[PDB]
Amino acid sequence: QTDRTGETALHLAARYSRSDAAKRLLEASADANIQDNMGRTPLHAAVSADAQGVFQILIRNRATDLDARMHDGTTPLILAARLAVEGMLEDLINSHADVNAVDDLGKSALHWAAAVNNVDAAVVLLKNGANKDMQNNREETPLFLAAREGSYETAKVLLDHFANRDITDHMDRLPRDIAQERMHHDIVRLLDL
């Protein structure tokens, strides 16, 4: 049963870090994948709440959909990269979440790590087979988004992984071009090295 935000008891257990409550619900065959009003499952809720105990319980539960999509296509892994929560991104990847899944705009977890300058997440994603040159629906690569947002440290990791700096967006702009337009002079310098 759902509340006014579409949350089940399991969503609430996640949001409030109630580990025993989570286990009893799952043992009673509570559906691990019910969506709230924004399409969040209890696993999205645990990532957003940084609820470590319930997070582990949910990823250890076989029937939990690790690649579940919010109503904008956001997965638990993309959410972990965006929010820069400790540990959870790597735990999801180790539990075999799809490193290359994308939201409804075509953005992977690596696109988002680049946009928010989550350098540690970019490193783990790349080490686990993330496509460094993936283009989203606007033809933007993670390097393009790092250059757009001024994410210097993540741009550097991407270049050290030999990300292709010549892949342009839908308007034929290079990462170097968007950095220049947005006055991210340190990135233009880095790209010119």
Owner of token pair 């959870």 = 88
Q: Within its chain, how far is the Cα of 109 from the centroid? A: 4
Asked whether the beta carbons of 103 and 129 are under 8 A apart, the reply is no
Asked whether the beta carbons of 13 and 23 are under 8 A apart, the reply is no
Name which of 139, 85, 91 is nearest 113 in CA terms.
Answer: 85
Name which of 82, 87, 86 is nearest 113 in CA terms.
Answer: 82
C-alpha distances (whole Å) from 73 to each of 38, 39, 127 are: 10, 9, 24
Asked whether the beta carbons of 156 and 130 are under 8 A apart, the reply is no
Buried b or exposed e, range 174-183, using 16+ CB within 10 angstroms: bbbbbbbeee
Q: What is the DSSP string of the chain?
A: ---TTS--HHHHHHHTT-HHHHHHHHHTT--TT---TTS--HHHHHHHHT-HHHHHHHHHSTTS-TT---TT---HHHHHHHHT-SSHHHHHHHTT--TT-B-TTS-BHHHHHHHHT-HHHHHHHHHTT--TT---TTS--HHHHHHHHT-HHHHHHHHHTT--TT---TT---HHHHHHHTT-HHHHHHHH-
- Counted domains in the chain: 1
The Cα 123–Cα 46 span in angstroms is 23
Name which of 81, 82, 80, 5 is nearest 50 in CA terms.
Answer: 80
Sequence-distant (≥ 6) Cβ neighbours of residue 150 within 8 angstroms: 117, 179, 182, 184, 186, 187
Kindly provide the resolution of this structure in angstroms, with one decimal: 1.9
Measured torsion, CA atoms of residues 113, 124, 43, 47, in degrees rounded to the nearest 10: -60
Sequence-distant (≥ 6) Cβ neighbours of residue 141 within 8 angstroms: 111, 132, 133, 134, 135, 163, 164, 167, 175
Asked whether the beta carbons of 85 and 47 are under 8 A apart, the reply is yes
The Cα 93–Cα 4 span in angstroms is 32
The Cα 193–Cα 137 span in angstroms is 29
Give φ, ψ of 189 to 5 degrees. Answer: -55, -50
Q: Could you tell me how many residues make up the chain? A: 193
Residue 163's CATH number: 1.25.40.20
In the numeric block, which tokens belong to residue 171?
A: 């308007």
Asked whether the beta carbons of 27 and 21 are under 8 A apart, the reply is no
Asked whether the beta carbons of 141 and 107 are under 8 A apart, the reply is no
Name which of 58, 20, 25, 53 is nearest 40 in CA terms.
Answer: 58
Method for structure elucidation: X-ray
Domain that holds residue 143: 1-193
- What is the CA angle 36-41-47, rounded to 5? 120
The burial of 117, by beta-carbon neighbours within 10 Å (0-12 exposed, 13-18 middle, 19 or more buried), is given as middle
